[PDB]
From a paper:
Through this function the BET proteins play a significant role in controlling transcription and regulating gene expression. The phenotypes generated by said inhibitors have been used to investigate the functions of BET proteins and their significance as therapeutic targets. This process has been limited by the pan-selective nature of the BET inhibitors, as they typically target all BET bromodomains with similar potency, hence specific proteins/bromodomains cannot be associated to specific phenotypes.
We therefore decided to replace the methyl-ester side-group first with an amide, as in I-BET762, which would lock the side-group in place through a hydrogen bond from the amide NH to the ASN140 residue. Methyl, ethyl and allyl bumps, the 9′ methoxy group and the ethyl-amide side-group typically met our criteria.
Numbering used by the authors: 346 to 455
The structure:
Amino acid sequence: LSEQLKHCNGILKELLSKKHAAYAWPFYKPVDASALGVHDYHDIIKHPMDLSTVKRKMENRDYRDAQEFAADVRLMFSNCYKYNPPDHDVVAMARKLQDVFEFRYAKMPD
Ligand SMILES: C=CC[C@@H](C(=O)NCC)[C@@H]1N=C(c2ccc(Cl)cc2)c2cc(OC)ccc2-n2c(C)nnc21
């Protein structure tokens, strides 16, 4: 990995760690629309994303730069905001986790 992508991998480890598990767990695996009963999810969200998919792409060295990594993580959060009403518990959780991501991502090295 490039030096910037190592920082990205370190953020990803933190997002999956026990410290943040109370609000991060909804984002661990892909949305199973049938299991959750949200039969309109794939009509509204055209590009699903989740942390296990980000992790698999990083493992296979599939990100070209830090920007591609950030776009996926932000996609994951934007899907959550797009589908759900603003006062929903899961949107608060997404908020909370995204503040962890954005704060540490802003500390990128040269
Ligand atoms: C995709 C389904 C929509 C949400 C839902 O279940 N109900 C609202 C109509 C759902 N809520 C949640 C959710 C709702 C309440 C609380 Cl406290 C935590 C998560 C959700 C749950 C999961 O369990 C394995 C996985 C993905 C979730 N998720 C994401 C991500 N964005 N919305 C959700």
